[PDB]
Design an enzyme around this catalytic site. Sequence first.
Site, PDB file in Angstrom:
ATOM      1  N   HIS A 185      -9.454  21.500  65.730  1.00  0.00           N
ATOM      2  CA  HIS A 185      -8.310  20.991  64.992  1.00  0.00           C
ATOM      3  C   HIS A 185      -7.557  22.070  64.239  1.00  0.00           C
ATOM      4  CE1 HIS A 185      -5.808  17.946  63.042  1.00  0.00           C
ATOM      5  NE2 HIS A 185      -5.860  18.742  61.988  1.00  0.00           N
ATOM      6  N   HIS A 211      -3.052  23.443  63.525  1.00  0.00           N
ATOM      7  CA  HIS A 211      -1.627  23.207  63.721  1.00  0.00           C
ATOM      8  C   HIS A 211      -1.037  24.602  63.912  1.00  0.00           C
ATOM      9  CE1 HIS A 211      -1.231  19.030  61.779  1.00  0.00           C
ATOM     10  NE2 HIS A 211      -2.479  19.372  61.511  1.00  0.00           N
ATOM     11  N   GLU A 215       2.327  15.120  67.463  1.00  0.00           N
ATOM     12  CA  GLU A 215       2.249  14.378  66.208  1.00  0.00           C
ATOM     13  C   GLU A 215       3.397  13.398  65.996  1.00  0.00           C
ATOM     14  OE1 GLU A 215       2.326  16.409  62.224  1.00  0.00           O
ATOM     15  OE2 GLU A 215       0.189  15.932  62.305  1.00  0.00           O
ATOM     16  N   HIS A 236      -0.028  10.711  62.659  1.00  0.00           N
ATOM     17  CA  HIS A 236      -0.288  11.549  61.481  1.00  0.00           C
ATOM     18  C   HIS A 236      -1.437  11.122  60.565  1.00  0.00           C
ATOM     19  CE1 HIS A 236       1.277  13.642  57.614  1.00  0.00           C
ATOM     20  NE2 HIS A 236       0.716  14.560  58.382  1.00  0.00           N
ATOM     21  N   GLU A 270      -8.542  12.299  54.021  1.00  0.00           N
ATOM     22  CA  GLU A 270      -8.643  13.713  53.681  1.00  0.00           C
ATOM     23  C   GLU A 270      -8.826  13.971  52.190  1.00  0.00           C
ATOM     24  OE1 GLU A 270      -5.230  16.096  54.681  1.00  0.00           O
ATOM     25  OE2 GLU A 270      -6.369  17.969  54.523  1.00  0.00           O
TER      26      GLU A 270
HETATM   27 ZN   LIG Z   1      -4.185  18.537  60.687  1.00  0.00          ZN
END
Ligand SMILES: [Zn+2]
Length: 380
Positions: free
Chosen positions: A61, A63, A137, A175, A205
């Site tokens: 994972h 970005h 995304e 997202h 998160e």
């Molecule tokens: Zn992320």
Amino acid sequence: HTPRLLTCDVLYTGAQSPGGVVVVGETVAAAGHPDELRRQYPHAAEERAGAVIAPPPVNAHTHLDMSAYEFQALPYFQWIPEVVIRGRHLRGVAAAQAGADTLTRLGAGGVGDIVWAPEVMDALLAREDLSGTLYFEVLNPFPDKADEVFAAARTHLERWRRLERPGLRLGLSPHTPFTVSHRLMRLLSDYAAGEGLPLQIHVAEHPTELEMFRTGGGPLWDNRMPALYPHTLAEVIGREPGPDLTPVRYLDELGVLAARPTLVHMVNVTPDDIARVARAGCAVVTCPRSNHHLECGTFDWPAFAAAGVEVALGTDSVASGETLNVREEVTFARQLYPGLDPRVLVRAAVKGGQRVVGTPFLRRGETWQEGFRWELSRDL
Ligand SMILES: [Zn+2]
């Protein structure tokens, strides 16, 4: 010839510890427990090869490109200035290509990349050196916009699905549970489940996410940019927040976990949430350093491991994860979980990630590669 016995703390060809690999020339003679080896090759000279010997780890994972939009949507990212500052350069094709270059220099291990800009997807999808999954995304918390956003996303996906090749597949990434309306979330998960597209969703998160699902308020929701969301969280998720609700329970009852999406972060969850994840057969990706720098709390790896949930490792973007090198997350994770068997960490980094993103073998006959000796890793 002359066998060489390279010893390590953890070997992954299930991981083994202590570990060792006997090499003859540039070929692996055997790989397993070291004592077995010193007994099988008494004349073999020994070499301390560092902490880990294993295939290059998968960064499950990250970005490689992001948007100011996803930073603006998440209040807690703003609370850590350095993260916002570091994230500014992560925009567009050029920066994404450089990130992919870094991944390749780091061992070309698989990657689970979240993509924002369509032009970045065009570029990365054409990278013959990358392997893993590229997740597009999607972000929009307005129920009324769900149908049109889904249609726009589907069009892009259908186009890219034709360009997809063996080793690098297209995926989808709603997202978060609060930046995607309940309607759009189901349209996306159902679509992906039906088309066979892997999914990744950032869930629980920061602690303030769990809080708003319970109260409808708190530091996250109460400090959001109003124009980016409906007036209430209830409007976004299609139900009223409550004491017994959590983002995980929300997704489970919404029927989204049925698609077995991979859940990212998952730091602020309850025992019941863990049970729901295990039942659904969802894999989870943890990003150690990122969670620490964003003050999100600590992923309960031992709890997830005990529940039998497949865990993979990621670094998240460099804005919060420092680097794209998962070997560093293994080191960090060792410190976070003193009671956790180190073998679990290495297996997760390699096999766990491979299972998530879609692994070289280290055994008799295989060419011994310096890439298997983590202590020699170079990012240049
Ligand atoms: Zn992320």
